[PDB]
């Protein structure tokens, strides 16, 4: 099965998922000088006041904080998007070292980690239908750098001990994802894909320019998670990122000058 090791990592994925070599794969390097300001882009609208988190799950590749997406409760709209996208889950990708971990890069710079807030287009009814459409998902990407702690992340950090291994979940209600956002909603946007198998080409990526800062102790706790299940040999969940993929026939647009 696919993963992030030498024998099953990103360079292998194309054998089971040929779309890995497709025309709109993610992540990509964001060349800031080549991205073009698009004055017709609208401000993002991030409406998370009614978000209902439910659970946190270690799925063997990352941990997902899952939300109730059976009503319009936490939605993303505006920006490059037409229509309304509902928050279903967020997760991160991170490194074994502070100098790597992000999936997107900015002028080839790697951040310590990257948060993905995953949303699906309500016109398709459910997430499984949405991933089969070119405009099915909108993923809000936010870079993490190591410095000061992010207080709004701490409730996530502190539950990780309870979901150390693959397949473990824990109740995780009343978590407010607004505490994970930077001040500015300036962003870059481009059409892309899921960054893990099945690598479906269904995502409008919206990547915030401003990173959030997290403490070294916060990211160290991410790195204590396990890829393996309980009672299997311990493999630390680190370096669960896909490297930048060719941009091909795409233009990255900026919301800002
Ligand atoms: C049918 C599709 C898939 C098996 C269903 C499970 C799923 O949601 N996968 C997923 C979600 C988000 C990302 S990312 N890293 O934000 O692009 C990567 C993978
Ligand atoms: Zn992701």
């Amino acid at each position: 099965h696919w993963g992030y090791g030498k024998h099953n990592g990103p360079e292998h994925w194309h054998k089971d998922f040929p779309i890995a070599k497709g025309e709109r794969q993610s992540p990509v390097d964001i060349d800031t000088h080549t991205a073009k300001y698009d004055p017709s882009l609208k401000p993002l609208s991030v409406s998370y006041d009614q978000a209902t988190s439910l659970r946190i799950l270690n799925n063997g590749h990352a941990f997902n904080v899952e939300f109730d997406d059976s009503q319009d409760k936490a939605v993303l709209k505006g920006g490059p998007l037409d229509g309304t996208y509902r928050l279903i889950q967020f997760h991160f990708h991170w490194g074994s070292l502070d100098g790597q971990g992000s999936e997107h890069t900015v002028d080839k710079k790697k951040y310590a980690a990257e948060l993905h807030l995953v949303h699906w287009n309500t016109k398709y009814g459910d997430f499984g239908k949405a991933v089969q459409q070119p405009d099915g998902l909108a993923v809000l990407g936010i870079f993490l750098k190591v410095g000061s702690a992010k207080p709004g992340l701490q409730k996530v950090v502190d539950v990780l001990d309870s979901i150390k291994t693959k397949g473990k979940s824990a109740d995780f209600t009343n978590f407010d994802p607004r505490g994970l956002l930077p001040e500015s909603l300036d962003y870059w946007t481009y059409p892309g894909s899921l960054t893990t198998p099945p690598l479906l080409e269904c995502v409008t990526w919206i990547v915030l320019k401003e990173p959030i800062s997290v403490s070294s102790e916060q990211v160290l706790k991410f790195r204590k998670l396990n890829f393996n299940g309980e009672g299997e040999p311990e493999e630390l969940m680190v370096d669960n990122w896909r490297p930048a993929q060719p941009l091909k026939n795409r233009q990255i647009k900026a919301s800002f000058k």
Side-chain angles (χ1 to χ4, degrees):
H1 271 354
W2 71 269
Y4 294 96
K6 177 180 160 201
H7 298 279
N8 67 357
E11 304 310 313
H12 292 269
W13 295 351
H14 71 101
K15 291 176 274 174
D16 277 322
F17 303 97
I19 204 176
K21 296 178 180 286
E23 299 302 311
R24 57 175 279 188
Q25 291 289 291
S26 293
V28 295
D29 182 55
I30 300 165
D31 190 86
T32 65
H33 282 115
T34 289
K36 191 192 165 66
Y37 171 74
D38 190 341
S40 75
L41 285 169
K42 306 174 188 180
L44 265 183
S45 172
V46 184
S47 300
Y48 288 170
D49 46 286
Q50 295 297 121
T52 296
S53 66
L54 293 177
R55 196 175 75 136
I56 190 171
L57 169 72
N58 180 332
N59 58 23
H61 34 97
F63 62 86
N64 293 350
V65 174
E66 298 165 352
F67 290 78
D68 175 16
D69 65 347
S70 69
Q71 292 182 265
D72 279 346
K73 282 177 169 189
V75 300
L76 182 68
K77 305 196 314 284
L81 309 173
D82 292 329
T84 297
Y85 291 66
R86 280 191 195 159
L87 180 65
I88 178 167
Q89 53 101 334
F90 71 75
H91 62 273
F92 304 81
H93 307 263
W94 62 91
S96 54
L97 303 160
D98 294 350
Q100 65 201 54
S102 66
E103 297 207 304
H104 294 88
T105 55
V106 179
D107 297 330
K108 302 295 180 77
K109 176 190 173 70
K110 295 180 169 79
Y111 288 86
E114 186 173 330
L115 166 60
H116 291 163
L117 295 126
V118 180
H119 309 75
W120 57 272
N121 193 328
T122 61
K123 79 190 186 184
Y124 300 124
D126 68 57
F127 179 83
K129 289 298 264 305
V131 300
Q132 302 178 58
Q133 317 302 325
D135 59 350
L137 277 54
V139 183
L140 184 57
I142 303 180
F143 295 118
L144 280 62
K145 68 183 180 182
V146 173
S148 301
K150 193 67 168 177
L153 182 59
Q154 192 59 35
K155 283 182 189 178
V156 175
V157 166
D158 280 330
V159 75
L160 297 183
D161 278 335
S162 72
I163 57 157
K164 182 178 177 178
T165 49
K166 181 175 49 69
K168 291 205 166 307
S169 66
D171 297 313
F172 201 67
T173 56
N174 305 105
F175 179 78
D176 192 334
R178 291 177 295 187
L180 298 176
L181 306 175
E183 288 178 4
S184 182
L185 295 181
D186 291 345
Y187 63 86
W188 297 283
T189 185
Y190 75 97
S193 75
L194 305 177
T195 68
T196 66
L199 300 170
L200 297 169
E201 288 180 339
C202 61
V203 182
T204 298
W205 278 96
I206 301 167
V207 178
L208 296 193
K209 169 200 68 181
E210 182 174 3
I212 60 167
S213 288
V214 305
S215 64
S216 53
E217 290 84 9
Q218 286 178 321
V219 66
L220 282 169
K221 288 182 182 189
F222 286 12
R223 304 181 180 132
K224 290 177 56 191
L225 288 165
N226 287 184
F227 284 127
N228 55 284
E230 187 183 4
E232 297 171 357
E234 184 163 12
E235 310 168 88
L236 294 180
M237 183 180 284
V238 293
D239 293 318
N240 61 345
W241 50 277
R242 188 190 196 190
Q245 301 301 306
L247 189 59
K248 296 183 172 179
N249 189 39
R250 295 177 288 179
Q251 288 179 332
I252 301 174
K253 297 300 192 183
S255 77
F256 61 93
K257 280 187 290 181

